[PDB]
Each structure stands twice: as C-alpha cells, then as structure tokens.
Amino acid sequence: GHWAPGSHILWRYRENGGPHVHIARPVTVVRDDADLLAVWLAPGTECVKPVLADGTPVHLEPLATRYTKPRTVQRDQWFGTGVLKLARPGEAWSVWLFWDPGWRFKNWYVNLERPLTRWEGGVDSEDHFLDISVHPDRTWHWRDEDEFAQALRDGLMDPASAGRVRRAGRSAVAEIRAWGSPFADGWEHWRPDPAWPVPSLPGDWDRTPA
Ligand SMILES: Nc1nc2c(ncn2[C@@H]2O[C@H](COP(=O)(O)CP(=O)(O)O)[C@@H](O)[C@H]2O)c(=O)[nH]1
Ligand SMILES: [Ca+2]
Ligand SMILES: [Ca+2]
Ligand SMILES: [Ca+2]
Ligand code: NA
Ligand code: NA
Secondary structure: OOOOOOEEEEEEEOOOOOEEEEEEEEEEEEEEEEOOEEEEEEEOOOEEEEEEEOOOOOHOOOOHHHHOEEEEEEEOOOOOOOEEEEEEOOEEEEEEEEEEEEEEEEEEEEEEEEOOEEEEOOEOOOOEEEEEOOOOOOOOOOOOOHHHHHHHHHHOHHHHHHHHHHHHHHHHHHHHOOOOOHHHOHHHHHHHHHHHOOOOOOOOOOOOOO
C-alpha cells in the first residue's frame, strides 16, 4: 500500500557489502504512488551516518583505505538546507534536489543505488558509489568516479555488479539528455508545507525486517 502525504518514514542505506544500516534519515512523505516516491528531508533532522571506528569522518580517510577501515554509526543532524528525494519504483537510482538558502536551486543529484525496497517503516537501499550532478542549464557531470573505482578494487563490487551500475548510469544520462522525468518536472519550485513538524529518529531506526 502507499503512505499518505505527511507520513513519517525512514530512508536508509546499508553498509557497503554488509547487512547493517549505516545511513538512516527520517523523512516526510510528499507523494507515494505507483509512479513515484517523493520525500522531504528537513534541516535539523536527527539522522544516522557512518563514521570510522574512531569516530573520525569517512571522507577524510585516504581513498586507499576509506572502504577497508572498520566503521561504526553516529547520530548527527542534517546540516544546511533540506533535500527533496525522488524515486521511481524499481529504478536503480533516486534523484535528490539541492538548494542554497533562499531556495536558490543548485542541482539535481542522481544517486545510483539498488532499487529501493519498501518495508513497514520506510525504504532501504545500497549506494552504488558513482553519482551524477545535473545543473539548471541541463549540463551534467559524474561525481565520485574515483570512489567507484576504489570500491571495485576492494571487491565491494563484482565486475558484473559494476557493469549493472554503469548501465544504470547510461540510462540516467539518457534521461538527462532527453530532459525527461524528474528533471523536467519543476520540482525545483516545490516547497514543503510549513506546518510539517521535523520527524524524530526512532529508537529502533536500525531494525531489519526479514
Ligand atoms: N545539506 C546536507 N547535505 C548532506 C548532508 N550529508 C550529506 N550530504 C550531501 O549528500 C551528498 C552525498 O553524500 P556522500 O558524499 O556521503 C555520498 P555519495 O556521493 O556516494 O552519495 C554529499 O555530497 C553531501 O553534500 C547533510 O547533513 N546536509
Ligand atoms: Ca551515492
Ligand atoms: Ca558517491
Ligand atoms: Ca560524494
Ligand atoms: Na511499476
Ligand atoms: Na527567510
């Protein structure tokens, strides 16, 4: 079934090549139907993110060991402006919209990922490392090609899995070139309902349904 707009759910990613949740983001459902799930991640929301086992930031670990060193999780608020996330059921990416203060639209962000799986409390995925940035002038470029390369070097991905990610990348680029959904759909002009509260991080944010 579908969640009513205004519902609170969790949007989650598992650790790379493991079963445990490492990213958990409480979000408000904007739209949920057979064609699209859209959610709003508000500024200040309490989230879960990965850190290295010593609590230090993943991004600061050299690439050579960034994906080999032991990790844990940390609660942290969503910094900066809120993000709108959009995902077609069954599709191997979601598209997130980023704005600067004053709702100055910055870019669409194509997050290549395992198609979201729905469960009672939200949606779960696995990030595929490679991303795409799309600018308001319709141009585009890759992000994190080097992290994608590193992940395959460390066996976080098979040649076959990597191939599937590259295929997804080509399909997303095809949509960008054609200016299809959701790029063409004016979500850059969407605004959250000011009455919506900031959703809480559930104490059981890490539960994994069978
Ligand atoms: N406003 C805001 N943006 C965030 C936050 N965390 C992460 N992001 C953004 O989400 C983007 C993707 O996160 P990542 O770099 O950890 C991963 P990946 O590139 O594989 O999706 C980052 O570039 C970062 O800017 C946050 O708390 N607030
Ligand atoms: Ca990503
Ligand atoms: Ca990335
Ligand atoms: Ca990145
Ligand atoms: Na469908
Ligand atoms: Na203002």
